[PDB]
Design a protein around this ligand. Structure first.
Ligand SMILES: CCCCCCCCCCCCCCCC(=O)O
Ligand SMILES: CCCCCCCCCCCCCCCC(=O)O
Lengths: 123, 68, 267, 283, 283, 68, 267
């Protein structure tokens, strides 16, 4: 019964890059399949398998984000680059062991508290 | 009146001077009067899937034309 | 050599004979062929009447039509043949009876037609009800449609009349009517009348149940479900049509317990 | 002659070919499934095969014990307005899903039932009350036998009813029951009606429910707390685990596709979509 | 012919020498380790040796049961805002250190796993609350099988999942599992990638983690408290002890020098100093 | 179908009229169907460390010159 | 008896298998069937790599179209299969190599189509040049069109550009491209896909040359020339069309002289 925490999130300008950390309780990756689902409301971004590889990204963000696994610390990150005002969203992290279901927000069992990221239109 | 049967050895212990090698057998003694009460042997058979695969009246030869 | 072809076949029982020139041989279900109850597996004590020929003959039930918008068809045994000559009579006249069959589904077209019909034989073809309000409530009158048979549907429609429900089967084709996947139905004895190949079907089904001999009026053994695997298309014609006919013949039939005649409320 | 733990057919070396033989060609219209092994469509090396179908044998497939039912009982205070809740349950696998679905791949069967009872307990009121180790009685009431009316009536005297006195906190209770079927095999499905509507009668008197019978009627289990009323209300749950052993089955059927609804073959609406979206031309 | 409990080679009496034989001279360039016994470099008496290598046999070396994981669960009040914590753990030896390091001296292996479960419990709140002896369920969910979502969902019905109902305070739970490896031997190390990055695809779709595979994936364990909510929160820990039995291994490697960091062969900085200070010319 | 095997006696009890002396043996009976379930025999072999010590193609004679 | 028909055939080599229901049997060229070089007739000295399955498998080259106004097609071996998997690789990696084949020209239509295609196998199919100004000057790039193949023409067209000639084959169909009469081409191993009869073609051609083992990149053994014997006519349709496909499979292949990879200027 893992417990997520959204850390390393804040304000930045447009064009830059920011990193997001997602440490977890346990017996972390044991619930498996960590995710990154943004949106002010609900919308995926990154998905990842605790084992093997096994990346995949939302078509809308494809080629600018990356989700990584630090099994030792038990933290899952999210490197967001070339930010643009439309990236100012409510970031969260998720998990479900079910080795599938990455295309449904309500398919999950675990959720953290969140961290608001702001891509300030400076330029 | 015991029932000694054989086991299909899996991971053979670096032995043939007791384990692994020489056939490993197990004993089984029934303690109750009812057949229901008996343990599950597991030494069950296996048959040809023909009563499903070839439910046909005539005989099938896998090299000749099916419909002749 | 002398022309013994798998498509050319002749079936004969009693005073009826079926011939076919476009067959895919015949299917002897589960490898068993009909026989009478063995003294070993016997149940009741009385003397068994073996009508044989009298009951063992091909009966052509009514013919249905196959067009594009057809979803499917379903027949029960010994239901359908409850109105068939002597077999029908002796049936009502007893409490227990076992009977085998030889379903000869016929359905021909031309070299210019195309499609496939899946003739399945489900032992104990239990179909589902029509309402989400009262389960297992389908009445007998609709459960035994007889020789007219029942029909499948392409969408589930719940019955909302709780005043006086319909009490009938509402079987959705892709679920065989029993909630499983139709694609897996190819486990029960079957044949596919894929127009191009053959023009008929043949499945000899032996007596299967959990009992050695059981009541016929009450219990139905084999279920004949014919659903279109491939749609019927013809030339450049918007409304093609060919007929489907079935002629199931009982085999190794016997009956125990002669009583007075049963008169069931059918409607 | 062939057993479960036997090695499967050894692959034989096959080479180039140009003949009047046609392995690859069939016609599923025959109902017959074309039997093609590796050495047919492709050239295969000689392989001394080692894999056995041991774990896939009928007995092995049902070799686990499933959870059939959860029965709730308690031991309320002597001062309570309500009666000491004792559980009564109709003996059937159907109430849950798993064990049922597995038993659905076949049309018939014979199997000696083995039962397990993992009982649990707990207090309920916000009182630091005390409860001594509780004693439990599991009573098998066959069809048409005295089913209890109270937690303390003559019935539990069970001069002829096979019961089980379980003392909480010990190695779970267990009993074995052979093939009690009225038939030759237990019918998981039954196309029919227990009654036949007649003509010189009334629709009421000849109406019966489709799919059911006496076949699947074996009796009920009655469970209570043998200890009397205690100053602190202590509830309890009785889990029954059934495991078929020494099993045989007849005539396969496809597994239950959509979600269950009732003891019948029936299905509810909105649960009629078993599959998902996936392109025809995408891997 | 030579077993574990056999006496080692007997020392033979050797005397003065002046010959064309050169025992003492080698050249480790040959990779071959010069085999020199006592009666070579010095004159030795005849010794009927008695020491045997019995306890150093493969089986004996791993003959202890190690602590692989600690799983926490509880039984909170029916009134709590949080959900009844049930544990889920990915089956692996790696999580700790000891058992892992020992399994690291070799490149491969085969061994029937034997498991032990020494469960413990305790209260948590400063309340003189009561708790009846608790029942525990240990559930083995193989890869891609229904992993529970709640402490009370259909999953635990386990019609096919091998589970263990442990009644607190009794002789610890135990099960044996043979070689479930997908290979011929379980790979403690794996030089590679489960996927191969391709060219007409994208870096995202062909990215994989180095060192991992399905080889070391066997499933997870799900543990809960079968008893319902009780007026007093009672936490619990599940210790899993694994012991390899009937073991074989292939190709030695040097033991793990520096402190572990992750399931990979990776090492953290600051822990790169395994040794200490000691003079070259001092004893 | 029991398995009686010998033990390597350690501290010999002032006996040879039962213990110590006359070979001490132990019985072993398998109670489960699976090889996994079997006990660990421990009567394992021992081999020559040559597949490590002398991984060389030619044969080594410990008295002659290594490199000739 | 058990249905062994000359039209029903199955070919298999390595990991590929061709099946046909409308064949005219198969033609084993000159009566010889593929085999490896005999120690007796051997030439080079090195060890020969026999890729077997790796190279001995059916490769489908690109598909062309057959309409009314089609004059013909021509393929070279081992040319065409110079871009085919391993066989392609090993080829470039050597100086000497011998290989047999099994050309399986497929081409089906209907009972309503008519015509004939002459699938000929000319050992050493030497085609003619396009200009009356410079003989034997056709460049390599056009000589080895590869899997796309070369096409025949119905009228001789001389190249008049002496500034930078075309340097390609200009083969006039009625002259097989080599100046002989097409009607006599029925001397080389061949089969005629006369629509009504069969629907494919099959010609196993053994290794023929004057040498025991020779260079592949440089020298082409067998020539596959497909020309329409009878025109393709359909119903009352002015533009009928059916596709033609060939799948030649090497047999008894070996290679001698492992060197560095050859990279030939193809364009
Ligand atoms: C002390 C407890 C005794 C229990 C006695 C046994 C009760 C019989 C239950 C049998 C369940 C088998 C269900 C099969 C139903 C069917 O398919 O017809
Ligand atoms: C009731 C519990 C059943 C447990 C089922 C067994 C789970 C298998 C665990 C195997 C651990 C062996 C690790 C080896 C990994 C490797 O080196 O590849």
């Amino acid at each position: 019964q893992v417990q997520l925490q959204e850390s390393g999130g804040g304000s930045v300008q447009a064009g830059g890059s920011l990193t997001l950390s997602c440490a977890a309780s346990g017996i972390t990756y044991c619930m498996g399949w960590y995710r990154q689902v943004r949106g002010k409301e609900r919308e995926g971004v990154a998905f990842i398998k605790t084992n093997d590889g096994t990346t995949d990204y939302a078509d809308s963000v494809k080629g600018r984000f990356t989700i990584s696994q630090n099994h030792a610390t038990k933290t899952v990150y999210l490197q967001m680059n070339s930010l643009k005002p439309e990236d100012t969203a409510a970031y969260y992290c998720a998990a479900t062991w079910r080795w599938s279901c990455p295309l449904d927000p309500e398919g999950y069992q675990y959720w953290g508290q969140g961290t608001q990221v702001t891509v300030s239109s400076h330029h | 009146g015991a029932q000694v049967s054989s086991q299909k050895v899996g991971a053979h212990e670096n032995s043939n001077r007791a384990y692994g090698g020489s056939t490993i057998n197990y004993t089984t003694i029934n303690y109750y009067r009812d057949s229901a009460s008996n343990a599950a042997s597991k030494q069950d058979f296996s048959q040809d899937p023909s009563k499903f695969t070839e439910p046909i009246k005539d005989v099938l030869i896998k090299t000749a034309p099916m419909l002749n | 050599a002398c022309g013994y072809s798998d498509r050319v076949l002749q079936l004969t029982l009693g005073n009826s004979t079926i011939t076919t020139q476009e067959a895919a041989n015949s299917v002897v279900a589960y490898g068993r062929w009909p026989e009478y109850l063995r003294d070993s597996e016997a149940n009741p004590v009385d003397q068994p009447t073996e009508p044989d020929v009298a009951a063992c003959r091909f009966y052509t039930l009514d013919t249905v039509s196959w067009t594009k918008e057809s979803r499917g068809w379903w027949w029960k045994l010994p239901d359908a043949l409850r109105d068939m000559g002597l077999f029908g009579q002796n049936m009502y006249y007893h409490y227990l009876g076992r009977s085998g069959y030889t379903v000869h589904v016929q359905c021909n077209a031309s070299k210019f037609h195309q499609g496939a019909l899946g003739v399945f034989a489900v032992p104990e073809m239990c179909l589902a009800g029509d309402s989400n309000t009262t389960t297992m409530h389908t009445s007998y009158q609709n459960a035994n449609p007889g020789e007219k048979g029942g029909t499948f549907t392409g969408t589930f429609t719940p019955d909302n009349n709780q005043t006086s429900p319909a009490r009938r089967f509402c079987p959705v084709d892709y679920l065989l009517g029993n909630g499983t996947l139709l694609g897996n139905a190819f486990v029960f004895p079957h044949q596919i009348i894929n127009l191009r190949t053959n023009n008929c079907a043949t499945l000899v089904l032996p007596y299967v149940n959990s009992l050695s001999i059981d009541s016929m009026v009450k219990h139905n053994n084999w279920g004949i479900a014919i659903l279109p695997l491939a749609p019927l298309n013809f030339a450049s014609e918007s409304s093609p049509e060919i007929p489907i006919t079935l002629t199931i013949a009982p085999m190794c039939c016997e009956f125990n317990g002669l009583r007075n005649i049963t008169l069931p409320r059918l409607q | 002659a062939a057993t479960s733990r036997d090695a499967l057919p050894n692959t034989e070396a096959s080479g180039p070919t140009h003949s009047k033989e046609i392995p690859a060609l069939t016609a599923v219209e025959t109902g017959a499934t074309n039997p093609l092994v590796p050495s047919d469509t492709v050239q295969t090396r000689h392989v001394v095969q080692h894999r056995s179908r041991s774990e896939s044998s009928i007995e092995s497939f049902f070799a686990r014990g499933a959870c059939v039912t959860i029965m709730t009982v308690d031991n309320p205070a002597s001062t309570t307005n309500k009666d000491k809740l004792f559980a009564v349950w109709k003996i059937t696998y159907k109430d849950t899903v798993q064990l049922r679905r597995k038993l659905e791949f076949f049309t018939y069967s014979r199997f000696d039932m083995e039962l397990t009872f993992v009982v649990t307990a707990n207090f309920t009121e916000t009182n630091n009350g005390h409860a001594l180790n509780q004693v439990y009685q599991i009573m098998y009431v066959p069809p048409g036998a005295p089913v209890p009316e109270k937690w303390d009536d003559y019935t539990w005297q069970t001069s002829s009813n096979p019961s089980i006195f379980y003392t909480y906190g010990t190695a779970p209770a267990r009993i074995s029951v052979p093939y009690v079927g009225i038939s030759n095999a237990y019918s998981h499905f039954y196309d029919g009606f227990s009654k036949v509507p007649l003509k010189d009668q009334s629709a009421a008197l000849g109406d019966s429910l489709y799919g059911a019978a006496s076949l699947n009627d074996f009796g009920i289990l009655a469970v209570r707390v043998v200890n009397d009323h205690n100053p602190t209300k202590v509830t309890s749950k009785i889990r029954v685990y059934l495991k078929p052993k020494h099993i045989r089955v007849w005539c396969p059927r496809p597994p239950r596709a959509v979600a269950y609804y009732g003891p019948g073959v029936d299905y509810k609406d909105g649960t009629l979509t078993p599959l998902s979206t996936k392109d025809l031309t995408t891997y």
